[PDB]
Design a protein around this ligand. Sequence first.
Ligand SMILES: COc1nc(N)nc(Nc2cc(S(N)(=O)=O)ccc2N[C@@H](c2cccc3c2OC(F)(F)O3)c2ncccc2Cl)n1
Length: 318
Amino acid sequence: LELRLKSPVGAEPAVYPWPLPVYDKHHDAAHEIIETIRWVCEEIPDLKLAMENYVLIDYDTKSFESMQRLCDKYNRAIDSIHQLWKGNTRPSTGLLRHILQQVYNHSVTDPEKLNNYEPFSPEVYGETSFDLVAQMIDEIKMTDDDLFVDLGSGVGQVVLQVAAATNCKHHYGVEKADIPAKYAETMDREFRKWMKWYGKKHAEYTLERGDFLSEEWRERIANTSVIFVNNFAFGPEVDHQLKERFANMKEGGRIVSSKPFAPLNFRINSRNLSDIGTIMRVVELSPLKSWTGKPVSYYLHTIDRTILENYFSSLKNP
Ligand SMILES: COc1nc(N)nc(Nc2cc(S(N)(=O)=O)ccc2N[C@@H](c2cccc3c2OC(F)(F)O3)c2ncccc2Cl)n1
């Protein structure tokens, strides 16, 4: 009582039990199977030739026999292609969206347990966050010298997306809450397994449980080159403590957030020398400035102590 999908790169097969797991009101494992097959067919043109036309539309998700026949036809077509080949790149954006959703559906079995009613919740990642994170990746252009940290990483979705798209030395996700941090452990295993199944490359990453406001995390923030933080619902105290942590970052250190940490129009004077605006540039970025999603904006902060230095030089030399 199971369905098996052979890996296009010879990794362990994907095994699903029957009856197939139900994900949410509108998605299930049956549709994930058909979409997986269709993605592999795009990835391998020979496979599309080896597979008969009708097979990827003439199926019945409510029938074991029909689902088994679909799986069989794909498995046999993958077998002939492996026969032809007898004789590790980053995933495309479309495949990655599919992989992240697949990883989530296999990891977060109980969605009520998450208790996230907020916008940008793990449950709606594909609809809201995925495209926005992709636009953010294109805008900040990270290299192998960069270290990326998502402060309050939930189930680790942003970290997985960034690790699958960039060549940062390392990507970290830190989450305090027990339930998301526990789900993140499964997300991590499911992501590595599925990426191996597709034969797709990703950078090194770590998902960990912890408080980003802890003593251990003070020096970790100071050594981070790119911080991602959804500070939208942060209270003044968490916001205050975070600014203190950012104050130890290196020149050129960057912070990508949902609310700015300093005003966009900050003008250094004698009365505001204690403000974070004295040591960081801030710009409002928006995909609307070929975006067709929500009219969102995000904030890029760049550590630059010359703001403070130029002010002191202006006072000594008028
Ligand atoms: C508006 O309602 C709302 N409620 C809550 N709780 N959080 C937010 N957050 C929020 C608000 C706005 S805004 N400025 O248009 O109001 C815009 C974006 C977010 N969140 C984004 C996010 C946060 C930080 C840096 C970002 C970012 O996206 C980025 F990639 F561009 O760089 C998000 N967060 C968590 C996971 C995935 C994603 Cl993608 N928004």
